[PDB]
Every structure is written in structure tokens, then in C-alpha cells.
Amino acid sequence: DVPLTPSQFAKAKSENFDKKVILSNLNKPHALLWGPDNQIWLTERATGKILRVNPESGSVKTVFQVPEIVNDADGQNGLLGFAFHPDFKNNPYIYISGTFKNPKSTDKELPNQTIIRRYTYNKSTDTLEKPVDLLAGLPSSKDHQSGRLVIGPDQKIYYTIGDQGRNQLAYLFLPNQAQHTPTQQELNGKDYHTYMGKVLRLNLDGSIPKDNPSFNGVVSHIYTLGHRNPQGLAFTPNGKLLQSEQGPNSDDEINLIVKGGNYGWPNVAGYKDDSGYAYANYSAAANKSIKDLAQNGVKVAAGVPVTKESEWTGKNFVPPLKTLYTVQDTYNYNDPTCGEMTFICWPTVAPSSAYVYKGGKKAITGWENTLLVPSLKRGVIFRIKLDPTYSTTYDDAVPMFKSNNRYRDVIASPDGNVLYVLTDTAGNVQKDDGSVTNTLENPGSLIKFTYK
Amino acid sequence: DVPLTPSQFAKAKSENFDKKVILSNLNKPHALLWGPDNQIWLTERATGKILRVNPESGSVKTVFQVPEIVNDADGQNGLLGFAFHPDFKNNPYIYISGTFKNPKSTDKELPNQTIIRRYTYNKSTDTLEKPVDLLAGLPSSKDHQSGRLVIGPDQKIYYTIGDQGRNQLAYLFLPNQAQHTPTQQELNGKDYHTYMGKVLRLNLDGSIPKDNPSFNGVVSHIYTLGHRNPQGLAFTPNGKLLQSEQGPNSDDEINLIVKGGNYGWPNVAGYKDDSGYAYANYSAAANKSIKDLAQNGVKVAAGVPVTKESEWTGKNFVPPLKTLYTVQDTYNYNDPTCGEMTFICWPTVAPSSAYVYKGGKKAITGWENTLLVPSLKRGVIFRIKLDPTYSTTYDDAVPMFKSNNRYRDVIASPDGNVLYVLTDTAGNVQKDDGSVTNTLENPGSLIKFTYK
Numbered sequence: 034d035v036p037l038t039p040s041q042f043a044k045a046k047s048e049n050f051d052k053k054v055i056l057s058n059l060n061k062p063h064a065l066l067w068g069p070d071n072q073i074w075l076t077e078r079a080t081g082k083i084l085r086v087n088p089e090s091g092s093v094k095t096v097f098q099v100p101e102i103v104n105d106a107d108g109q110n111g112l113l114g115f116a117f118h119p120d121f122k123n124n125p126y127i128y129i130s131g132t133f134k135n136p137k138s139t140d141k142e143l144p145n146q147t148i149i150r151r152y153t154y155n156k157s158t159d160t161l162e163k164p165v166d167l168l169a170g171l172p173s174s175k176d177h178q179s180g181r182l183v184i185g186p187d188q189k190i191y192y193t194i195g196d197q198g199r200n201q202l203a204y205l206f207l208p209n210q211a212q213h214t215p216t217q218q219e220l221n222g223k224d225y226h227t228y229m230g231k232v233l234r235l236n237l238d239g240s241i242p243k244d245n246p247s248f249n250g251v252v253s254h255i256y257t258l259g260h261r262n263p264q265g266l267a268f269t270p271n272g273k274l275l276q277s278e279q280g281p282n283s284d285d286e287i288n289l290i291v292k293g294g295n296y297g298w299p300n301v302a303g304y305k306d307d308s309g310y311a312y313a314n315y316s317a318a319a320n321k322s323i324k325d326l327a328q329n330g331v332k333v334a335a336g337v338p339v340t341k342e343s344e345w346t347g348k349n350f351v352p353p354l355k356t357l358y359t360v361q362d363t364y365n366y367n368d369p370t371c372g373e374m375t376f377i378c379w380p381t382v383a384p385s386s387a388y389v390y391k392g393g394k395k396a397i398t399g400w401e402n403t404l405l406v407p408s409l410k411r412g413v414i415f416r417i418k419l420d421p422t423y424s425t426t427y428d429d430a431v432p433m434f435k436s437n438n439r440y441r442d443v444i445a446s447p448d449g450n451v452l453y454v455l456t457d458t459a460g461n462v463q464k465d466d467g468s469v470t471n472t473l474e475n476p477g478s479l480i481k482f483t484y485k
Numbered sequence: 486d487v488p489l490t491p492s493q494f495a496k497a498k499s500e501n502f503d504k505k506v507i508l509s510n511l512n513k514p515h516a517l518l519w520g521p522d523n524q525i526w527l528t529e530r531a532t533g534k535i536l537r538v539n540p541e542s543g544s545v546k547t548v549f550q551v552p553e554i555v556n557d558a559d560g561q562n563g564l565l566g567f568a569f570h571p572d573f574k575n576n577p578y579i580y581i582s583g584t585f586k587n588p589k590s591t592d593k594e595l596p597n598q599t600i601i602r603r604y605t606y607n608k609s610t611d612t613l614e615k616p617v618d619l620l621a622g623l624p625s626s627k628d629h630q631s632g633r634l635v636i637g638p639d640q641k642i643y644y645t646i647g648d649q650g651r652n653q654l655a656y657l658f659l660p661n662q663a664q665h666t667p668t669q670q671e672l673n674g675k676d677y678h679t680y681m682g683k684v685l686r687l688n689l690d691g692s693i694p695k696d697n698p699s700f701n702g703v704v705s706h707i708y709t710l711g712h713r714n715p716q717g718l719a720f721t722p723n724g725k726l727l728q729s730e731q732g733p734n735s736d737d738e739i740n741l742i743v744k745g746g747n748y749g750w751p752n753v754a755g756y757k758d759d760s761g762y763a764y765a766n767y768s769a770a771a772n773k774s775i776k777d778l779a780q781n782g783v784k785v786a787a788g789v790p791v792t793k794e795s796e797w798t799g800k801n802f803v804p805p806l807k808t809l810y811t812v813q814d815t816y817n818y819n820d821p822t823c824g825e826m827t828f829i830c831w832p833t834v835a836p837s838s839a840y841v842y843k844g845g846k847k848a849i850t851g852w853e854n855t856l857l858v859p860s861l862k863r864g865v866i867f868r869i870k871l872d873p874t875y876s877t878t879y880d881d882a883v884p885m886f887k888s889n890n891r892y893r894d895v896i897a898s899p900d901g902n903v904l905y906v907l908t909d910t911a912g913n914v915q916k917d918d919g920s921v922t923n924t925l926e927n928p929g930s931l932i933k934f935t936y937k
């Protein structure tokens with residue numbers, strides 16, 4: 034899709050909803066869920082705390098703090114994945130993923146691992162107990178961790194693990210592994226270094242489903258590959274799997290996740306259109322002092338190999354349902370008319386989640402079969418309509434609730450007339466006039482919007 | 486997708502198939518079907534003849550000639566739709582559409598109608614009889630008639646009817662009706678002038694299905710709208726509906742047809758990307774002496790209103806699964822790298838059909854879940870892979886059977902190892918070296934390709 038203008042974002046004020054801050058003292062709140070107890074549960078990414086909030090009264094309890102979570106102030110690591118077993122009454126399990134030190138690591142630049150871990154909920158003492166590591170030794174870094182953890186209708190865990198930031202900034206010269214897959218020998222040694230830029234599908238005990246897809250002749254935990262930073266994952270009522278993902282200077286994506294698909298990163302951003310992006314592989318540059326001009330690969334310094342999207346030899350490439358956004362090769366990623374911080378005008382929205390709106394007896398008119406996608410950089414919640422079979426999007430991403438806030442997650446109440454959102458503690462966001470600010474209106478908050 | 490180069494088309498020679506020309510100099514052969522008698526049936530658009538061809542010996546019989554078919558030498562009108570009843574053993578019916586004179590027409594420029602008609606096959610006399618008009622008074626013109634007619638798994642007739650060529654060439658100043666839908670009053674009067682640029686869904690007796698979608702508050706024969714020239718339509722084994730469609734200078738489409746969808750034409754060609762196309766509405770131009778610059782709306786003469794794809798206020802817009810092809814705004818539609826005949830280099834392939842390959846006892850290796858799309862302008866047949874649920878394409882359109890022929894239709898034998906193809910009697914096609922020729926290698930032919 035084509036970017037909205039600052040004016041178009043600023044008008045999305047959602048005057049038909051009442052706003053109320055429920056909690057305002059949260060530290061890097063990350064994931065939000067409607068629990069099986071009809072309470073709101075949420076995570077703090079850096080502290081490792083799991084909180085439960087009474088939606089009616091607003092009282093809150095810290096149910097548990099995951100010990101030894103590792104988090105860097107300049108990083109996106111920490112406590113990430115968070116989901117309830119779907120039959121919680123009879124299987125009182127909570128599944129998380131988190132950053133932990135890796136005692137086997139021989140890399141002082143990458144000292145950590147990601148672990149998918151199960152806890153047992155004790156309703157008598159209201160806490161979590163009996164930790165069990167389902168899948169350990171997964172990649173960890175400060176960048177593009179993703180880490181959405183959901184349980185599908187097949188009662189399998191689906192887990193997004195980002196590309197770790199390879200081929201940008203601090204990891205510029207590391208070779209991106211989004212396209213790479215394990216050998217059988219690597220699986221035998223539990224070497225999961227290729228588990229970057231993937232959606233994983235695991236059994237509830239961490240093992241490999243016997244009907245997972247094959248990649249390059251090997252069936253592993255990988256379900257799909259070729260992802261950059263997929264922070265949104267959500268099943269629809271008819272069992273389809275929708276996803277949101279952050280692109281580089283362009284081409285954030287809404288994807289339909291299908292078994293065995295290849296979503297193209299890093300060779301393809303968004304559509305395979307050769308428009309506004311090309312794959313500049315700095316790991317293949319002979320000179321490691323080469324600079325990244327950060328023009329999305331369209332303009333590069335001498336010495337870095339560049340592959341056009343159409344020059345890639347790919348297999349099972351699946352294009353996105355929608356891009357937020359796609360621009361021409363003539364696009365100027367340095368436009369000075371935007372200000373000193375030109376990145377704010379980049380054709381992206383930085384989606385942070387993806388949530389299937391299920392309606393209810395007070396469902397909001399017109400919102401049937403919508404997907405809600407929070408935007409960090411634009412301070413809106415997008416509403417994206419699909420057809421009733423969730424096979425295609427209809428029309429465009431409609432912005433909602435414009436504010437100077439970094440929206441991190443969103444859910445809705447069972448009746449469907451109240452939305453609950455989390456906001457980041459700090460960072461940059463676009464203002465009504467299109468400029469950048471790091472003064473957030475509601476830092477680290479749980480906010481509700483009630484239809485009136 | 487990005488256009489293939491002339492060299493990439495030239496190498497797609499399909500050396501793994503044996504070619505045998507069964508017939509040539511057919512009079513504008515148009516549609517072919519594997520018949521209930523395991524013979525090949527095909528139509529001649531210009532004559533109204535329905536021919537049956539013996540696969541083994543190639544003997545041909547003129548089974549029937551549809552009387553009073555109207556065809557213009559320079560036109561795309563004539564005998565069009567052609568399908569067998571799916572339970573032919575117990576329902577020996579053949580369904581057609583055709584151009585016929587309209588006696589109540591009050592326009593000398595548009596004197597004809599399209600009629601969807603049923604015939605009964607009499608096996609004892611080996612001919613057709615007892616015609617029944619199912620739906621008459623449909624639009625008719627020389628351009629963009631489409632006319633693909635299939636019976637769905639719901640035992641409904643699905644019928645594509647093109648936009649009649651409005652807003653180009655001989656119909657430049659007529660207002661395109663692809664976005665328009667009937668009022669209840671027009672329906673009551675059987676005024677079907679808005680049945681342009683649509684997929685129609687009809688009961689077998691021609692009546693309006695009560696479960697057809699609603700458009701602007703009215704349920705009509707319209708199933709989807711916003712199409713230009715959709716010549717390809719085919720159901721998948723799991724009941725989805727795939728489609729191909731010719732765009733203008735760009736953005737031929739492969740579409741997934743979903744009930745009630747709006748496929749954007751003429752406001753949107755291909756994706757809603759503002760890339761290489763804009764909607765110039767010549768019917769709204771200040772005067773009818775203005776010239777069409779034929780630069781796909783990116784540059785137009787003064788006095789014609791232009792609407793960007795992103796400026797359209799649309800409802801239920803459904804984007805294509807694949808475009809053949811999409812180009813940048815700076816693309817040169819009048820490129821001098823080719824000869825005076827710039828159109829042959831336009832980033833299009835002119836898809837003429839769409840056929841779901843179903844395999845069989847001799848299925849071709851690797852062709853699972855593919856869609857075959859013949860190209861008129863490039864002299865190839867494309868193979869397009871989808872995932873096993875027919876929810877997305879995988880990778881790109883792979884060209885096959887490169888020749889100096891305009892491929893018009895394609896089917897496969899039940900065993901799956903033989904393809905049968907129709908070619909046009911006349912027209913332009915691109916040579917190996919990228920230049921145009923109107924010398925066709927196999928004019929008006931039925932061609933058999935057998936996997937080695």
C-alpha cells in the first residue's frame with residue numbers, strides 16, 4: 034500500500050471512543066492477553082514480571098517474576114513469549130520465552146540464548162511453579178527477537194523468532210540466516226543457529242511435530258522461514274494464521290502464514306517488485322570497513338554485493354497480503370523536508386503485534402473479520418478488514434487512536450466494545466504534524482478505549 | 486512481479502515435451518474442453534461451430550453450429566462461453582454464451598447482446614437441440630467480452646463478462662461500468678447495462694441465486710465486480726476460484742475470486758500501489774477531441790481527469806495474487822529499445838485463460854497445485870505454483886512452450902502427461918529476440934504437447 038500523509042494520520046482521532054488509563058507505572062510492558070479467568074494478563078519485558086489486572090476495577094497483582102531474565106537497555110531482549118494452555122482448567126500451564134545467559138556461549142558479543150519454557154500455575158498460592166525448558170539454546174541478540182508465542186487449534190506451539198538483526202547496525206557484517214535451515218546433524222546436536230527469521234511449530238513438550246514441513250530435505254521445528262522481525266501472530270476463527278512483521282526502511286508486512294512457506298527476507302522485502310529495496314549483503318563485502326548508507330539497498334557504497342529481488346533464486350516464496358508501505362525506487366530516504374530525523378517519514382509503521390477482532394454482543398459496527406495492528410512509530414492502531422474466510426484483505430489499513438504513544442499490543446473485551454492497549458515506556462513517535470518526538474503521552478501504560 | 490527479459494522468454498523452450506500439431510487454420514478457435522466422451526471439444530469464436538476431435542487420429546466432426554452468431558472481423562465477439570454439465574451422464578447439457586443481434590437495442594453503435602444459452606446433446610443424432618435462453622440482454626461490444634463459463638461445485642453457473650472496452654481505443658469516451666451495479670428498478674426491467682466487468686453467478690435456469698452477494702443494497706447476478714477482461718476462470722479441487730485477467734499497458738492479473746469482492750478496475754490496475762498506472766477517465770474529459778497518450782494514465786493530455794489508485798474511495802477491494810507485470814512510474818511505455826511497435830514491449834503478457842492442473846496417473850513431476858496461464862503476446866504458457874490449499878502463489882510465473890504463437894487456451898488429459906493447446910489464427914506475438922511479428926508459426930491450431 035501507499036503511505037498515508039501526516040495529515041491523514043493526524044485525523045485518525047477516534048472521537049467515538051472514551052479513553053481511560055488503567056495503569057501508568059509499567060516498565061516496558063510487552064504482551065497483553067485476555068486470560069481464562071477473564072482477567073487481563075500482561076508482561077514486563079525487562080523485569081520479567083507477569084501481572085494480572087482486574088478489567089472492571091483495575092486492581093493489579095504481580096503473579097510471578099521470571100528469574101534471571103537478561104535485558105539490555107538498548108535492546109529488545111528479555112521476557113517475550115507468553116501464552117496460556119487452551120484447556121487451562123485441566124492443564125494449568127503457561128508458556129513463555131525469554132532471554133537467558135547461555136553457559137555454553139563462546140561469543141562475548143552474543144552471550145545469551147532464548148528459551149521456550151513452561152510453568153505450572155498453582156491456583157491455591159496464585160503463582161507459577163515447576164519450570165520446564167521445552168526448547169533451549171535458541172539464538173539471542175539485542176535486535177529483532179520477535180518472540181510471539183501462540184498455541185494453535187492443532188494444540189501446537191507456534192513461535193516467531195526474528196533474524197537477530199543480522200545485516201544491519203551492530204550486526205551489519207553477520208550473514209543473515211533467515212533463509213537457512215538445519216542439517217540433520219545440527220538437529221542431533223541441538224544446534225539451532227539457523228532458527229533465525231522463522232516461525233517455529235513445536236509440540237507442547239518442545240519436540241518436532243512429525244507433520245512439520247521439510248526444508249532442504251530436513252524436517253525441523255521450522256514451519257516457515259524468511260522473516261525479519263515478525264512480532265504479530267494470531268489465529269483466525271477458521272484456523273488461518275495471520276502475522277505482522279517489521280521491514281527495514283520500507284515494506285512492513287501483513288502475512289498469511291502457510292505451512293512450508295518462504296517469506297523472502299532478506300532477499301525480498303514485501304512484494305517481489307524491485308521497488309524501493311534491494312538486498313545488500315554486507316557479510317559478503319570483502320572490506321569490513323565498508324559503510325551502510327542505509328538507503329534500503331537502492332543506493333550503496335562501493336564494495337557490497339547487491340541482489341535485486343527479481344535476481345534471487347527462491348523456493349516457495351509467499352508474498353504479503355499487505356505492505357505498510359511500498360514506495361518507488363525514486364523514493365528519498367533522506368528527505369530533508371521531513372526534518373533532522375528523516376527516518377520518521379520512512380514508509381513504515383513498525384507493527385508491534387497482530388490481533389484478530391472476534392466481536393461479541395457489543396461488537397463495533399463494521400469491524401467484522403478485522404485484524405488490529407498496533408503501530409509503534411505512527412502512534413495508531415490499524416484496523417485491517419479481511420473477507421469472511423480470512424483469505425484476502427479488503428481495502429486499506431485504517432488508522433485509529435492517533436496519539437503520541439508507541440502502541441505495543443492490543444486486545445478486545447469479550448463483548449467487543451472495549452479495546453485494551455499497551456504503550457512503550459520510551460522511544461520515538463510521529464506527531465500530528467509529522468515531526469518526531471520522544472515525549473510519549475502515556476509512557477508504559479495499560480489503556481482502554483470504550484465505544485460510546 | 487517484474488517482467489522477464491526477451492532472453493528469459495526465449496530460453497523457455499520446454500525440451501521435455503514432444504509437440505504435435507493436430508489441426509491448423511481453425512477459424513478463431515477459442516475454448517477447448519475434455520469431453521464426457523474423452524474426446525476433445527473446441528469452439529470457433531467466429532463461426533459458432535462446436536468441433537469434436539479424436540485425440541488419437543485427429544479426426545474432426547462439426548457437431549453443431551450455433552445459428553446467428555454475430556462476429557466482426559476486427560472484434561473479440563462471437564461464440565464465447567462453453568461448458569458441459571458436470572453430471573453429463575444424467576444431464577446431457579451444454580452451456581454457451583454468444584454475441585447475438587439485439588432487436589430492441591436503440592444504439593446503432595452497440596446493436597448486439599450477449600446471451601447465455603443451454604443446449605441438450607442428443608447422442609443418437611450426435612448434435613445439439615432444444616435451446617433455452619438462460620440470460621439475455623447482456624452487454625455486447627467488439628472489445629473485452631471475456632465470456633468464460635464454468636459450473637461450480639455448488640452447481641451454479643459462473644460467467645465472466647468484460648468491461649466492453651470502455652475507456653480505450655474505439656470506446657475511449659464511454660464511461661466504464663466495471664464499478665457500477667444495478668438498481669432494483671433496473672433489475673426489475675432486466676436492464677443489465679451494469680453487467681460489465683463482472684463475474685456473474687447464476688442459477689442453472691438463469692435466475693438470481695438468493696445467496697448471491699449484495700452490492701449497494703441489491704442482490705443481482707453479480708458475484709464480483711471491478712474487472713477489465715477476465716478471460717481465465719477455474720475452480721480448484723478444494724473449491725476455490727482462480728482467475729486470470731488482462732490489464733492495460735501493465736498489471737495483467739492472477740486473482741482469487743471471493744464472494745462479493747471488488748477487483749478494483751478501472752480505478753486500480755493490479756495492486757493499489759500508484760506504480761505505473763493511474764485512472765484517466767476519458768468519459769469525463771472536457772471534450773472528445775483529446776488524445777489518449779497511451780502511457781497508462783501516468784502522463785495524459787490536458788483535459789482528462791486523473792485519479793491515483795490511492796485516491797479512489799473503494800469498498801471490498803481485493804488485490805491480485807500475482808501481476809504480470811508491475812513497473813515503476815518512470816517506466817517508458819514508448820521505449821525506443823524496441824522498434825516502432827512499442828506495445829510489444831509493454832510489461833504485460835495478455836493472459837487468455839486459466840487452467841487448474843489436476844495431475845492423474847501420469848502426472849508431470851513437480852506440477853502439483855499449479856495453474857496454467859496461456860499468454861497471447863509472449864507465445865508462452867505460464868506455470869504458476871500455489872501452496873496445497875490454493876491460498877497463495879509460490880515463486881513466479883514460469884514460462885513454457887516458447888514459440889511465435891498466440892496461445893489462447895490449454896487443458897490436460899486425464900492422465901496428466903498430455904497438454905492440449907489452442908492458438909489464434911492471427912495477431913501479434915513477440916519473437917525470441919524481443920521484436921514483434923504477425924507471422925504465427927501455427928495459425929489457428931490445436932496442438933498436443935506430450936511429456937517425454
Ligand SMILES: O=C(O)c1cc(C(=O)O)c(-c2[nH]c(C(=O)O)cc2C(=O)O)c(C(=O)O)n1
Nearest residue numbers: 109279280281282376379381383409410461
Ligand atoms: O521507522 C522504521 O522503519 C522503524 C522504526 C522503529 C521504531 O520503533 O522506532 C523500529 C523499531 N522497532 C522496535 C521494536 O521494539 O519493535 C525497536 C525499533 C528501533 O528502531 O529502535 C523499526 C524496526 O525495528 O524495523 N523500524
Ligand SMILES: O=C(O)c1cc(C(=O)O)c(-c2[nH]c(C(=O)O)cc2C(=O)O)c(C(=O)O)n1
Nearest residue numbers: 561731732733734828831833835861862913
Ligand atoms: O500488450 C498488451 O498489453 C496487450 C496485447 C494484446 C494482444 O493480444 O495483442 C491484447 C489483446 N488481447 C486480445 C484478446 O483477444 O484477448 C486482443 C488484444 C488486442 O490488443 O488486439 C491486450 C489487451 O486486450 O489488453 N493487451
Ligand SMILES: [Ca+2]
Nearest residue numbers: 280281282381
Ligand atoms: Ca523498520
Ligand SMILES: [Ca+2]
Nearest residue numbers: 296297298303
Ligand atoms: Ca516477506
Ligand SMILES: [Ca+2]
Nearest residue numbers: 302303304306
Ligand atoms: Ca519489494
Ligand SMILES: [Ca+2]
Nearest residue numbers: 732733734833
Ligand atoms: Ca493489455
Ligand SMILES: [Ca+2]
Nearest residue numbers: 748749750755
Ligand atoms: Ca484488479
Ligand SMILES: [Ca+2]
Nearest residue numbers: 754755756758
Ligand atoms: Ca497498481
